[PDB]
């Protein structure tokens with residue numbers, strides 16, 4: 010029978026397995042499915058490890074999450090359409106669950122699906138090549154359990170290896186002589202480390218917002234965040250200041266583009282990540298900016314130069330869990346023959362160009378959110394993934410945006426209408442800035 | 455013509471280039487030589503970078519050296535037999551030159567050789583395979599300058615990729631909740647970070663000795679080092695204590711196997727490295743312990759399962775620079791046909807077994823030094839590499855060992871007999887504990 014290789018067992022790869030199992034249950038014949046995962050367990054970025062740099066096996070650490078991390082968007086906007094929060098936890102929980110709770114949720118669905126047997130853990134993929142003569146991909150992987158590398162042929166490869174794990178780490182004058190901690194968000198683990206310290210946070214996006222917030226919450230003396238384009242612009246706490254571009258450090262003195270100066274004890278680089286695939290040749294390797302319209306992906310999933318190769322979750326993310334579902338169902342259907350891809354590369358390239366032009370038509374944030382909503386709507390209309398109230402999820406994000414603009418430090422103290430019932434979520438039992446306990450234990454009581 | 459791929463432009467790979475150049479100058483026909491180097495420049499571990507974890511390109515950071523690092527053995531034991539220190543710096547320097555100074559010496563030699571043109575920088579090797587039908591290795595590499603991967607065929611591969619860069623990072627109960635910095639020696643950079651802190655150093659070998667010493671020299675409050683087998687046993691300074699095995703951490707409380715306890719601010723894991731090759735299949739991938747007799751390498755260099763593949767510098771090291779040379783000349787001669795390898799695998803395996811048994815015949819430190827000395831002597835006898843006074847090199851290591859046993863903190867304040875003259879080296883212009891300046895500028899005046 011045909012065989013499919015899935016690279017990664019994060020939310021996207023897990024969605025892919027769930028998709029195939031769902032189709033199998035309906036009586037459709039499915040190909041063999043083999044999922045290769047570098048880590049010892051599934052969950053992708055939702056794993057936590059104290060390790061940074063390289064893991065116990067010597068592979069680059071995938072994890073970018075830190076202690077005390079909570080959902081940074083409304084949970085109502087990421088609910089699986091086929092596995093409700095209610096079905097999983099039994100009851101209704103708050104709108105911003107901590108890391109451990111969302112991991113439990115992700116895990117519940119694939120536990121129910123009985124798809125763990127398709128996964129090979131501690132098995133980083135080393136290489137993928139395609140042979141036009143045989144029409145097969147050869148996947149080379151290393152099993153760290155046995156310390157043995159092997160190769161096998163597949164009819165399709167679906168890459169779900171994430172794009173928020175290989176850091177963008179710029180050099181600025183003085184970085185190499187600074188008497189202090191300099192760490193990228195990727196390797197940041199414990200905000201308690203910076204208690205009583207003056208912290209410099211470089212960047213102006215999600216990681217800068219939240220890591221600055223963690224350092225503040227866990228007692229940093231002061232936060233200085235610097236941008237190079239547009240300021241985050243929120244009304245910050247009294248000990249937090251936003252500066253324009255960093256020019257250089259001299260000793261522990263940071264010099265900014267406006268000529269202002271500031272002594273800092275540590276520097277956290279929240280400068281984002283790159284799309285990076287250490288395991289792919291030129292003819293299969295996705296090269297793209299991080300944005301809502303991903304380069305070279307037909308329908309945002311099928312690699313234009315070889316549409317037997319697919320990619321999941323490579324877009325920048327407003328929507329997440331249910332977007333990955335929409336993609337995985339779509340990719341499944343393409344492989345199963347429920348969807349037929351163009352045999353015209355020009356048509357595939359035009360599809361991408363339209364997506365890019367439409368994304369660029371406006372720089373408005375609500376426009377961006379609606380753009381991705383439109384994408385999820387597009388995909389879901391084209392498979393048997395259950396229709397769901399995308400407009401509502403959209404509204405959730407809109408309200409969330411307003412809540413952050415109002416109070417950057419208290420936006421997690423809010424509730425949103427479930428997309429299934431339309432009922433607001435319970436208020437959590439402890440204000441976020443007071444919620445020091447990470448555990449799923451403390452969260453659910 | 456035939457072609458040889460050299461993986462790595464550290465001391466070993468550089469020695470290999472030098473070896474081929476020396477033969478070409480004598481009128482011997484040499485194969486084409488292509489050297490792949492992941493870093494932007496040559497030098498191997500001797501390159502310094504402030505970066506830890508992954509480099510600017512997204513590749514694992516090779517560098518394990520830190521700020522303030524000086525040569526840990528007497529320079530007289532690591533002189534090139536074809537390029538005296540005298541010839542390089544013109545004059546005579548001390549016996550423990552800082553990193554920057556030894557890098558300059560390393561570079562001096564290869565500059566003279568005009569071998570840089572054989573090197574491709576920013577070009578990590580991704581994979582190497584061998585095809586028995588064609589009798590060629592296929593080497594796949596990624597050029598980060600152009601973001602393009604390519605493949606090419608070679609008649610031989612010489613792997614000089616180091617073995618002190620992929621860390622051994624053990625988990626101990628409590629590591630994941632410790633409120634403090636936990637770094638492996640590999641990512642350790644600036645001792646100033648631990649000034650006024652209580653540091654736990656885990657390990658009992660070279661890195662533990664020297665990193666503990668740097669932390670001490672740069673103002674750590676206290677140093678606690680722990681061993682799991684044989685204690686380092688030196689007379690430590692008043693703020694440095696040596697403890698038995700770590701059991702667990704609870705909060706910032708370290709518990710040791712003798713039941714004692716110590717609160718610490720940071721933990722530096724000097725737990726060594728593994729031999730790790732992310733780019734090799736089973737049938738080419740060296741698997742060995744770190745020791746003086748390396749598994750599966752005939753004469754310590756030719757891979758017993760495919761003797762057209764060679765490895766350099768994979769032994770643990772008392773000797774370093776001139777051992778790499780001896781190996782490089784020997785490998786070169788095998789490739790050129792000046793040396794003919796056995797066609798009998800059993801004989802190759804027996805060579806390795808003899809080396810292992812002989813290494814293990816005594817656990818005495820001077821016996822170990824003499825053992826590797828004997829290895830270098832063996833290799834040098836078998837090529838036109840210039841004989842040099844190996845016995846003298848030994849005597850240097852012998853005196854160095856005595857000096858360390860005498861005063862662990864002041865052994866770098868000593869001199870040794872130039873292997874060429876027999877004249878002792880001059881004393882450095884500043885005692886080690888006082889030389890706070892890394893610069894080659896200060897050292898050379």
Ligand SMILES: Cc1cc2nc3c(=O)[nH]c(=O)nc-3n(C[C@H](O)[C@H](O)[C@H](O)COP(=O)(O)OP(=O)(O)OC[C@H]3O[C@@H](n4cnc5c(N)ncnc54)[C@H](O)[C@@H]3O)c2cc1C
Nearest residue numbers: 017019020021047053054080081133134170171173322329
């Ligand atoms: C710090 C951070 C916080 C976030 N917080 C939120 C949040 O609160 N809410 C939200 O909705 N979204 C959040 N996101 C977005 C996040 O990307 C998604 O929630 C989700 O983790 C993406 O799933 P994925 O499977 O597409 O990628 P990943 O989760 O990165 O999964 C990739 C998987 O592929 C594996 N892999 C990688 N390379 C290889 C290889 N060579 N061989 C084999 N396996 C490999 C990895 O081990 C990993 O498990 C966050 C992202 C980051 C970086």
Ligand SMILES: Cc1cc2nc3c(=O)[nH]c(=O)nc-3n(C[C@H](O)[C@H](O)[C@H](O)COP(=O)(O)OP(=O)(O)OC[C@H]3O[C@@H](n4cnc5c(N)ncnc54)[C@H](O)[C@@H]3O)c2cc1C
Nearest residue numbers: 462464465466492498499525526578579615616618767774
């Ligand atoms: C912290 C530390 C301090 C030391 N101090 C001393 C000292 O004072 N004196 C002394 O004599 N010895 C010292 N040593 C021993 C040291 O190993 C040798 O001096 C020397 O650096 C070894 O040379 P090498 O080329 O064999 O390995 P390395 O120097 O590690 O060279 C390996 C090279 O291969 C490259 N490479 C690796 N993987 C790939 C890939 N996939 N593709 C392409 N290129 C790759 C790397 O970029 C690197 O440049 C020290 C070692 C360490 C770890």
Ligand SMILES: NC(=O)c1ccc[n+]([C@@H]2O[C@H](COP(=O)([O-])OP(=O)(O)OC[C@H]3O[C@@H](n4cnc5c(N)ncnc54)[C@H](OP(=O)(O)O)[C@@H]3O)[C@@H](O)[C@H]2O)c1
Nearest residue numbers: 079080081179212213214215216217219237238279280281
């Ligand atoms: N759950 C949570 O609380 C949480 C926490 C952290 C992250 N995350 C997730 O992680 C994902 C990644 O977000 P991210 O913010 O880390 O990456 P990102 O969204 O790509 O943002 C990167 C930021 O770094 C800046 N930057 C890039 N290169 C720079 C340079 N050389 N010098 C100075 N600044 C530079 C960019 O500014 P320019 O625009 O000027 O280039 C940009 O603002 C997000 O989707 C987010 O949802 C979640």
Ligand SMILES: NC(=O)c1ccc[n+]([C@@H]2O[C@H](COP(=O)([O-])OP(=O)(O)OC[C@H]3O[C@@H](n4cnc5c(N)ncnc54)[C@H](OP(=O)(O)O)[C@@H]3O)[C@@H](O)[C@H]2O)c1
Nearest residue numbers: 524525526624657658659660661662664682683724725726
């Ligand atoms: N000043 C300098 O120039 C300098 C500084 C640092 C390093 N170096 C070089 O770097 C090289 C590497 O030396 P290294 O000492 O880092 O590595 P190493 O020589 O292999 O020593 C590793 C040490 O870690 C201990 N260890 C390993 N696993 C452990 C675990 N799970 N728990 C506790 N302890 C554990 C080992 O103890 P056991 O014996 O019990 O296994 C061993 O003593 C050396 O050749 C040295 O020359 C040079």
